[PDB]
């Protein structure tokens, strides 16, 4: 579990492909951190386009963490447009989502100055 949360947060792709050879069981893909963060959340927060593309290719299912953020709320806060294109070109549902504080993905991309 915690090896996957470290290897996705810091872009280690080859460690992620080894840990996701058990794709018949999808518990550890959509698992949560102590802040409810998915591996899809952590890979998009630090801006890793390859890890967020591998996790979306195996069904990361676009969950939400605590404070109601998503992978697009994390990729916007940081201005990583490459992982933003991977999220946006998958489905058009995530760009209209809101957190608990009512902010969309647009509000974090403008507050940090991207």
């Amino acid at each position: 579990k915690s090896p996957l949360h470290f290897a996705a947060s810091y872009g280690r792709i080859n460690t992620c492909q080894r840990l996701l050879q058990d794709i018949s069981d999808t518990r550890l893909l959509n698992e949560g951190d102590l802040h409810g963060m998915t591996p899809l959340h952590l890979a998009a927060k630090n801006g890793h386009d390859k890890v967020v593309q591998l996790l979306l290719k195996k069904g990361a299912l676009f969950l939400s963490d605590h404070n109601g953020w998503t992978a697009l709320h994390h990729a916007s806060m940081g201005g990583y447009t490459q992982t933003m294109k991977v999220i946006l070109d998958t489905n058009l549902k995530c760009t209209d989502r809101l957190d608990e504080d009512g902010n969309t993905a647009l509000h974090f991309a403008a507050r940090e100055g991207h």
């Binding site: 090896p3 810091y10 872009g11 280690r12 630090n46």
Partner: protein, 38 residues
């Protein structure tokens, strides 16, 4: 006025160098041997 403009272009190259350097440190942590502290 010419002194602060000269300092702005020195600082603009400082932001460009640190952003190039921040991508390398993100790439060291991406491709690294981690065995003992795994």
């Amino acid at each position: 006025e010419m002194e602060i403009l000269k300092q702005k272009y020195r600082l603009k190259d400082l932001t460009f160098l640190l952003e190039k350097q921040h991508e390398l440190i993100k790439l060291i942590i991406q491709k690294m041997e981690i065995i003992s502290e795994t």
